[PDB]
Design an enzyme around this catalytic site. Structure first.
Site, PDB file in Angstrom:
ATOM      1  N   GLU C  60       0.826  -1.200   0.000  1.00  0.00           N
ATOM      2  CA  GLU C  60       0.000   0.000   0.000  1.00  0.00           C
ATOM      3  C   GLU C  60       0.862   1.252   0.000  1.00  0.00           C
ATOM      4  O   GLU C  60       0.571   2.219  -0.713  1.00  0.00           O
ATOM      5  CB  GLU C  60      -0.923  -0.015   1.216  1.00  0.00           C
ATOM      6  CG  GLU C  60      -1.528   1.330   1.560  1.00  0.00           C
ATOM      7  CD  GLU C  60      -1.575   1.573   3.055  1.00  0.00           C
ATOM      8  OE1 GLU C  60      -0.500   1.598   3.688  1.00  0.00           O
ATOM      9  OE2 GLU C  60      -2.688   1.729   3.598  1.00  0.00           O
ATOM     10  N   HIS C  61       1.941   1.242   0.782  1.00  0.00           N
ATOM     11  CA  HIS C  61       2.812   2.405   0.869  1.00  0.00           C
ATOM     12  C   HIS C  61       3.446   2.723  -0.477  1.00  0.00           C
ATOM     13  O   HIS C  61       3.506   3.889  -0.882  1.00  0.00           O
ATOM     14  CB  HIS C  61       3.892   2.169   1.923  1.00  0.00           C
ATOM     15  CG  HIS C  61       3.645   2.886   3.214  1.00  0.00           C
ATOM     16  ND1 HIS C  61       4.359   4.001   3.594  1.00  0.00           N
ATOM     17  CD2 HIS C  61       2.768   2.643   4.216  1.00  0.00           C
ATOM     18  CE1 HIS C  61       3.932   4.415   4.773  1.00  0.00           C
ATOM     19  NE2 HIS C  61       2.964   3.611   5.170  1.00  0.00           N
ATOM     20  N   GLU C 137       6.575   5.503  11.015  1.00  0.00           N
ATOM     21  CA  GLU C 137       5.134   5.557  11.220  1.00  0.00           C
ATOM     22  C   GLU C 137       4.689   4.602  12.317  1.00  0.00           C
ATOM     23  O   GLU C 137       3.720   4.890  13.016  1.00  0.00           O
ATOM     24  CB  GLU C 137       4.388   5.262   9.917  1.00  0.00           C
ATOM     25  CG  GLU C 137       4.437   6.393   8.896  1.00  0.00           C
ATOM     26  CD  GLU C 137       3.437   6.214   7.764  1.00  0.00           C
ATOM     27  OE1 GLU C 137       2.743   5.177   7.737  1.00  0.00           O
ATOM     28  OE2 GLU C 137       3.340   7.113   6.901  1.00  0.00           O
TER      29      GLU C 137
END
Ligand code: HEM
Ligand code: HEM
Lengths: 51, 60, 446, 379, 78, 99
Positions: C60-61, C137
């Site tokens: 996804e990143h 993150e």
């Protein structure tokens, strides 16, 4: 008193009535057994073997 | 296919009221059964000695 | 003078069509000039094993970080030049990429979505950069208490099951992940039968279907060497995880019980019950006069800064409960009141509060499905989970069927004498021991 | 450092209870009767313990034991009559205490009032059993009638009566049982008094005005302590006058003849404190009705808070309620007098009228009059 | 219910002289007697009448009972 | 007629003698406590001083001088509107609870 004379309170009452009846049954059995009340036990099968 | 124990829970143990009623009735019947059984055991162990075992000889 | 029933009848209906490869193309058409087109993929952490956990988050990143057809800057430049907003969200059960864009820009948006889903570069330098970003993150996400307590709830509730794994994954996996693992994840989980192309707004279903046939057709549902991932039911374990950190200002506690799956009909009565329980935050204006007894007592005694009830549903299991933030010395009281409300709904629910809960649920359903983005999200998620987008009229009928008897039945089935799963964070010393919490789940009176 | 009185746990409890308890400044002498009850309880406990050092509970030796206490034991007569007259002082102070609670609306402290009713029942039972202990004629026959009252209960009835009696009638088993119970009950009373004080401290003390006195509060140690000591001295004056100057004033002479089960004494009456309930019982002809009336006479104090319809807590500013309250007091005096007197034509009708008036005043007249007062004050 | 936080009161000034510098019994008779008479006058109107009725009933009851015990000459007449 | 007997009761009740007013003597139930806490500060301070002075007078078993007694007409029911509003709000909450 007039506060509790309301339909929602009637609904709550109906909800808890079977529970109250069951607790009454528990109380009745408890009393009969603890006192060994012969009047009731006489009919009770295989408990009538006593007395 | 519920087992016996699950059936017992869902029938009597789920709500405390039915639990208590079951406990009371079991109490009465267990009292009767245990009293009868233990009395039988004690009498058998002491068979021939207890007055109830020999009252007939002296009675009547 | 349209009525609520008439309004539900007039709602535009979702049309679902399937490409031969297995991609399902769904659309709801409105007069709006803006459209939201997105691809929902049935891939998530629950489909990941221990070593490859978090690969979905990595993919996804770096999905928007470049394609073989257009390099990393090119995709962003195209999206911004046409004014579109590109966003992705990854959950334990679903992964989605959606583009908010003008209706006239639907073809280019579909092209970009197909390129992102299929022809993802996964370049190694970008992989290292995203590795660093993801570690940072994770360190940031440690600060967000709500996310942490919910992750703890999932870990303790579904221990030994894939659902326990977090979406982001352990840091060790993040640093150990390689290009091969990401490529294998894409090959295994991104498959046409497990994907849904959904759109909302000014989208013609025929045009969307034709664009899908043009671009997504190459994607295939065949599994290499017939290595087919198989869905696994997840066991719900009643457990308690307490991270006692007295330095933290406020204590977060999340308590839940096992809930229905997505398709189980009991979700609607349970949502009504949770709406009856309600939600409260210190910033709410209603305060003491609020209908929710828990909210009213919390406002009167300032028990908790915030408390909310959640109904998280997965395919075969779900977490049903509430999350409340409170002072160190008010945790026991709030837990007592929450469990009291649960048992009151289980045993002696009344018609009036049921009507309130049904109305709240109706308003939430209608209000949430507003705008192209939420409508498209609902379309995709409904196709993936329910296999069908349940129309609002069907939701209304199911809500209307709910009565006090139904609420009592379902709440007794899911909430009464059931072992709960508890996660606590912060100064949680006053949080009752698990034996007390379990004892609270039943009433000696009933 | 910290003040030991505040810090130490036991001293903290004693301090909050008696030393630095916030108390209203305006409470009158009527409020001293609670501390007087406490002093009476302590005096009774000590006196009865010292009596029990010389009292044997066998029927053959009970009356002889009391005579031994009166004659041979050094200062034994002082102790025995201190006990006998202290019981009467206890009941005087209890009646005045409940009267103060009724008059000044102190019954609004619900839990304190209910614990007080329980205490009244326990004290009455203690006294009734204690009176049997000398085993005189009056003791035996009063015990016979009061326990035989229990036979009126349907079903269990005779079974319960013989269980309490320990046999077919009052006899040695009953005397020993009553001695044991009379010993143990005062300690339960002492514990219930602590519960009572706890409940009261939760809400403070009511004042004669009946208006909250948080604005005007004074420490108990520097004032009510010396006030209660003065009240205790006055109580000791009255009690010692009874003990020394007129030792056998409140007692029936027929308790000095040893109990004879074959002969009834010329008149059977309970002690003076039970006389009003005895009259209430005698008024109703049916046995079960009489027993229920005797129970209701005391249990109406439970219903008293619910029957409070006035907007003002105290009767200080309720003249009509004051008139009704003093009518009730006179009615209780009348009931006592009737109970003392025999059941003949003049007294029977007086007793029936007094009982009806007592129940009417407590149940119907006082609430209606309170409502009328509220209407008069433009409420 | 500690002494510090019982209630909220504002702008009330109280002056209290020491026990040692004041007389224990100021005007015990000069002012006490008129005050007692005033208190008695108000109270006697309410307390007394109920008890007065009892004295009548006590007297009537005692007289009636004595009358009943006395012989009826008519019964033994003829 | 009725005002005559009401005035009689006003004099019969002694709260005028202690300098109190009618609303000062009301029993402090929960509704009364809420009404009190809703009072404006001037009314509240007047109330507390009146009650304090009355308690002081009762302590020494004395009564206020005849000229300083409250007048039946001059008596003002300060607490009545607030207490009525509290009672009305409680009635509404009870009514919503009923059904
Ligand atoms: C052994 C029996 C009792 C003891 C030792 C006792 C003790 C006390 C004491 C020390 C107080 C403090 C205030 C005062 O002394 O006036 C008090 C207050 C009170 N008691 Fe008891 N009492 C007894 C019986 C009763 C009974 C029989 C009742 C009611 C039927 C009762 C109800 C009350 C009430 C209402 C108050 C409130 C007084 C106030 O408002 O200031 N008590 N008691
Ligand atoms: C605290 C409340 C008490 C009350 C109201 C009470 C009341 C009485 C009464 C009315 C009598 C009969 C007196 C007579 O006619 O001769 C009596 C006798 C007696 N009491 Fe108590 N009593 C109390 C506490 C105690 C305690 C704590 C004891 C502990 C042993 C005790 C031991 C006795 C004994 C041994 C007698 C028989 C001796 C005698 O009658 O002179 N009493 N009591």
């Amino acid at each position: 008193l007039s506060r509790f004379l309301g339909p929602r309170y009637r609904e709550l009452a109906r909800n808890w009535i079977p529970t109250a009846s069951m607790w009454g049954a528990v109380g009745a059995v408890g009393l009969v057994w603890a006192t060994d009340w012969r009047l009731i036990l006489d009919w009770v099968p295989y408990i009538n073997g006593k007395f | 296919a519920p087992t016996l124990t699950a059936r017992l829970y869902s029938l009597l143990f789920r709500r405390t009221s039915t639990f208590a009623l079951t406990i009371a009735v079991g109490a009465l019947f267990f009292e009767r059964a245990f009293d009868q059984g233990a009395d039988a055991i004690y009498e058998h162990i002491n068979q021939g000695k207890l007055w109830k075992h020999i009252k007939h000889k002296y009675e009547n | 003078t349209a009525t609520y029933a008439q309004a539900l009848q007039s709602v535009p209906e979702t049309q679902v069509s399937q490409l031969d490869n297995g991609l399902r193309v769904a659309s709801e058409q409105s007069s709006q000039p803006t459209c939201t087109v997105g691809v929902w993929i049935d891939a998530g952490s629950r489909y990941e094993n221990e070593k490859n956990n978090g690969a979905g988050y990595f993919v996804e990143h770096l999905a928007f970080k470049g394609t073989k057809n257009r390099p990393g800057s090119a995709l962003e430049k195209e999206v911004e030049s046409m004014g579109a907003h590109l966003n992705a969200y990854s959950t334990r059960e679903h992964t989605a990429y959606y583009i908010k864009a003008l209706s006239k820009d639907l073809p280019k948006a579909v092209e970009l979505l197909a390129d992102i889903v299929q022809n993802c570069s996964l370049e190694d330098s970008q992989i290292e950069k995203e590795r660093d970003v993801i570690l940072q993150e994770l360190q940031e996400n440690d600060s967000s208490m709500r996310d942490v307590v919910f992750d703890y709830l999932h870990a303790t509730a579904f221990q030994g099951t894939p659902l326990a794994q977090s979406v982001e994954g352990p840091s060790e996996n993040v640093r150990k992940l390689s290009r091969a693992d990401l490529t294998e994840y894409v090959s295994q989980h991104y498959k046409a039968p497990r994907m849904v192309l959904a759109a909302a707004g000014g989208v013609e279903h025929r045009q969307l279907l034709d664009l899908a046939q043009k671009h997504f057709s190459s994607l295939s549902g065949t599994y290499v060497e017939d290595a087919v991932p198989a869905f696994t039911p997840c066991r719900f374990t009643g457990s308690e995880i307490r991270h006692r950190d007295d330095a933290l200002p406020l204590a977060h506690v999340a308590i839940a019980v096992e809930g229905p799956g997505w398709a189980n009909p009991d979700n609607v009565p349970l949502q009504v019950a949770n709406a009856i329980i309600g939600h409260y935050d210190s910033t709410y204006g209603g305060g003491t006069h609020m209908s929710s007894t828990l909210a009213s007592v919390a406002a009167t005694r300032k028990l908790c800064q915030s408390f909310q009830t959640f109904n998280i549903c997965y395919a075969e299991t779900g977490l049903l409960g509430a999350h409340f933030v409170c002072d160190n010395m008010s945790i026991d009281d709030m837990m007592f009141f929450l469990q009291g409300q649960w048992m009151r709904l289980c045993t002696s629910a009344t018609e009036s509060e049921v009507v309130r809960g049904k109305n709240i649920l109706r308003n939430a359903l209608v209000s949430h499905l507003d705008g192209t983005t939420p409508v498209c999200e609902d379309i995709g998620r409904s196709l993936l989970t329910y296999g069908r987008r349940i129309p609002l009229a069907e939701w209304e009928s199911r809500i209307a069927e709910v009565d006090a008897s139904v609420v009592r039945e379902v709440c007794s089935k899911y909430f009464y004498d059931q072992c709960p799963a508890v996660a606590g964070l912060g100064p949680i010393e006053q949080l009752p021991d698990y034996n007390r919490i379990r004892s609270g789940m039943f009433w000696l009176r009933f | 450092m910290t003040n030991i009185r505040k810090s130490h746990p036991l001293m903290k409890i004693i301090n909050n209870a008696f030393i630095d308890l916030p108390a209203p400044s305006n409470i009158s002498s009527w409020w001293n009767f609670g501390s007087l009850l406490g002093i009476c309880l302590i005096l009774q406990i000590l006196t009865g313990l010292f009596l029990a050092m010389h009292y044997t509970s066998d029927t053959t030796t009970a009356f002889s034991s009391v005579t031994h206490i009166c004659r041979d034991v050094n200062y034994g007569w002082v102790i025995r009559y201190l006990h006998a007259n202290g019981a009467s002082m206890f009941f005087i102070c209890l009646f005045i205490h409940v009267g103060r609670g009724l008059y000044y609306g102190s019954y609004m402290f619900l839990e304190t009032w209910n614990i007080g009713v329980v205490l009244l029942f326990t004290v009455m039972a203690t006294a009734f059993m204690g009176y049997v202990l000398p085993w005189g004629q009056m003791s035996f026959w009063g015990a016979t009638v009061i326990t035989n009252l229990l036979s009126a209960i349907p079903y269990i009835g005779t079974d319960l009566v013989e269980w309490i009696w320990g046999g077919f009638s009052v006899d040695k088993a009953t005397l020993t049982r009553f001695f044991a119970f009379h010993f143990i009950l005062p300690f339960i009373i002492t514990a219930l008094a602590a519960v009572h004080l706890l409940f009261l401290h939760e809400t403070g003390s009511n004042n004669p005005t009946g208006i909250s006195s948080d604005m005007d509060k004074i420490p108990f140690h520097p004032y009510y302590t010396i006030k209660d000591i003065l009240g205790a001295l006055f109580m000791m004056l009255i009690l010692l006058i009874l003990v020394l100057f007129s030792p056998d004033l409140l007692g029936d002479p027929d308790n000095y003849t040893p109990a004879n089960p074959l002969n009834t004494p010329p008149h059977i009456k309970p002690e003076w404190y039970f006389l009003f309930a005895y009259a209430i019982l005698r008024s109703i002809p049916n046995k079960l009705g009489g027993v229920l009336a005797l129970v209701a006479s005391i249990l109406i104090l439970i219903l008293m808070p619910m029957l409070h319809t006035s907007k003002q807590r105290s009767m200080m500013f309720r003249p009509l309620s004051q008139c009704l309250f003093w009518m009730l007091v006179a009615d209780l005096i009348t009931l006592t007098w009737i109970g003392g007197q025999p059941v003949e034509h003049p007294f029977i009708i007086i007793g029936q009228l007094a009982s009806i008036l007592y129940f009417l005043i407590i149940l119907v007249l006082m609430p209606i009059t309170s409502i009328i007062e509220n209407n008069l004050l433009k409420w | 219910r500690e002494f510090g936080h019982l209630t909220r009161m504002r702008h009330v000034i109280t002056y209290s002289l020491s026990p040692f510098e004041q007389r224990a019994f100021p005007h015990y008779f000069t002012k006490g007697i008129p005050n007692v008479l005033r208190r008695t006058r108000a109270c006697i109107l309410r307390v007394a009448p109920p008890f007065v009725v009892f004295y009548l009933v006590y007297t009537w009851g005692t007289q009636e009972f004595e009358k009943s015990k006395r012989k009826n000459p008519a019964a033994y007449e003829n | 007629w009725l005002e005559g007997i009401r005035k009689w009761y006003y004099n019969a009740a002694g709260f005028n003698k202690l300098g109190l007013m009618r609303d000062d003597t009301i029993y402090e139930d929960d509704d009364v406590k809420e009404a009190i806490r809703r009072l404006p500060e001037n009314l509240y301070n007047d109330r507390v001083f009146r009650i304090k002075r009355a308690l002081d007078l009762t302590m020494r078993q004395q009564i206020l001088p005849k000229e300083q007694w409250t007048k039946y007409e001059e008596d003002k029911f300060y607490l009545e509107p607030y207490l009525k509003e509290v009672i009305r709000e409680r009635k509404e909450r009870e009514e919503w609870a009923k059904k």
